[PDB]
Amino acid sequence: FNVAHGLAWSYYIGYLRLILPELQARIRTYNQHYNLLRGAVSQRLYILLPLDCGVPDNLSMADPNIRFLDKLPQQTGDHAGIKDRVYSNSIYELLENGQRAGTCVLEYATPLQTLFAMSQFSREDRLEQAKLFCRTLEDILADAPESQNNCRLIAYQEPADDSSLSQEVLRHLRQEEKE
Amino acid sequence: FNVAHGLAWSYYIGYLRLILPELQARIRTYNQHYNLLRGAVSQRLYILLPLDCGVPDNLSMADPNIRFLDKLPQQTGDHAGIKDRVYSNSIYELLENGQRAGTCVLEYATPLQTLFAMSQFSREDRLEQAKLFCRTLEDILADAPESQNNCRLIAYQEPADDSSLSQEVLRHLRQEEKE
Ligand SMILES: CC[C@H](CC(=O)c1cc2cc(OC)c(OC)cc2[se]1)C(=O)O
Ligand SMILES: CC[C@H](CC(=O)c1cc2cc(OC)c(OC)cc2[se]1)C(=O)O
Numbered sequence: 642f643n644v645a646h647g648l649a650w651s652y653y654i655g656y657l658r659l660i661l662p663e664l665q666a667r668i669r670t671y672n673q674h675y676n677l678l679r680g681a682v683s684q685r686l687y688i689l690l691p692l693d694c695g696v697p698d699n700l701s702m703a704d705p706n707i708r709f710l711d712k713l714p715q716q717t718g719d720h721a722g723i724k725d726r727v728y729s730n731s732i733y734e735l736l737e738n739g740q741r742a743g744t745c746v747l748e749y750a751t752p753l754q755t756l757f758a759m760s761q762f763s764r765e766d767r768l769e770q771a772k773l774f775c776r777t778l779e780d781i782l783a784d785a786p787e788s789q790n791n792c793r794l795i796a797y798q799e800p801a802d803d804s805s806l807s808q809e810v811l812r813h814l815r816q817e818e819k820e
Numbered sequence: 821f822n823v824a825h826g827l828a829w830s831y832y833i834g835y836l837r838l839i840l841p842e843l844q845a846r847i848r849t850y851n852q853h854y855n856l857l858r859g860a861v862s863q864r865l866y867i868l869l870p871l872d873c874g875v876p877d878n879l880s881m882a883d884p885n886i887r888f889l890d891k892l893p894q895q896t897g898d899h900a901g902i903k904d905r906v907y908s909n910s911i912y913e914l915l916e917n918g919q920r921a922g923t924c925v926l927e928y929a930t931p932l933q934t935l936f937a938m939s940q941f942s943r944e945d946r947l948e949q950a951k952l953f954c955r956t957l958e959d960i961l962a963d964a965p966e967s968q969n970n971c972r973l974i975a976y977q978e979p980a981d982d983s984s985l986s987q988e989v990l991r992h993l994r995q996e997e998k999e
Contacts, residue, residue: 748901
């Protein structure tokens with residue numbers, strides 16, 4: 642109950658509070674200096690929350706239609722001993738019927754792999770802690786001033802290896818255009 | 821009790837497990853390509869754990885005798901959506917009587933600023949959660965295979981603004997030489 646609470650706050654306090662306020666400027670810099678009226682990167686950080694807590698230690702999205710396209714201009718800031726601590730972010734192209742249907746900054750919510758490491762608790766405890774985590778992070782980001790149409794939490798659960806994350810994400814980017 | 825548990829595991833799982841196994845190689849690369857038989861960077865990551873949980877959002881060590889000297893060769897690895905996620909680390913010179921008495925990679929344990937944010941709980945709850953955090957992290961790092969004379973946890977508490985972190989650290993680096 643509290644592991645998930647504490648991880649949400651720490652993720653917000655140790656990471657999002659630091660990268661969110663400048664994300665939208667880095668994104669416009671890319672969108673100018675680089676880059677099609679559909680291939681413009683969404684002005685939002687999209688945060689992947691596998692409910693099964695299986696966050697890959699690489700780029701594997703398992704969704705043939707989510708591909709790495711470019712890195713974002715890196716932000717640098719001093720933080721907690723580390724001079725010019727670098728903040729790396731990655732842009733992904735989203736495809737529908739083999740065509741590029743949009744583009745966004747994507748990454749996984751890494752505190753979840755700590756819940757995975759603690760269940761691999763039981764698998765049902767894993768799931769409830771992932772939900773609590775999502776619900777806490779959503780509420781933190783709601784009252785958080787650094788969070789103003791710059792952040793979307795994509796929580797999902799694939800029922801098997803053979804069962805469309807791309808479509809899910811794509812819906813969120815469509816709703817951005819129609820707004 | 822569990823916030824501190826979970827933050828220790830996440831710090832270990834989200835960060836130390838990823839940077840510790842290569843830290844000592846990055847350190848030798850510096851120690852050759854750069855750099856005095858005393859001015860060689862300690863082959864250890866030193867991790868500052870203010871028990872008061874006051875981790876600065878900058879480089880402030882408040883110890884005139886702990887100064888930024890150089891950055892470490894940055895490590896890059898794919899992780900959790902982010903391609904070539906960069907790992908930045910900073911080297912500090914340690915001074916005694918105005919002379920450089922040693923050198924080490926230093927940084928603060930950032931999960932602590934999440935305990936700070938939650939107490940600024942009461943200040944005594946803050947302190948116990950910081951201790952629990954230290955004790956959990958120490959035990960994790962003991963059975964952790966990635967952690968083999970590459971990591972030291974410096975926990976301390978300054979009683980006031982006018983009251984020697986440098987000496988504390990310096991003792992740990994001396995004990996390394998005499999071993
Ligand atoms: C893949 C990119 C991420 C994003 C990232 O850099 C950080 C995550 C994070 C989480 C914390 O608590 C949950 C925390 O507490 C101080 C500090 C940080 Se920084 C990664 O995990 O490497
Ligand atoms: C100043 C340098 C640090 C070190 C660092 O990068 C990370 C810390 C961290 C902590 C986590 O839980 C506690 C976590 O859970 C996924 C991931 C990370 Se990455 C910083 O906080 O920026």
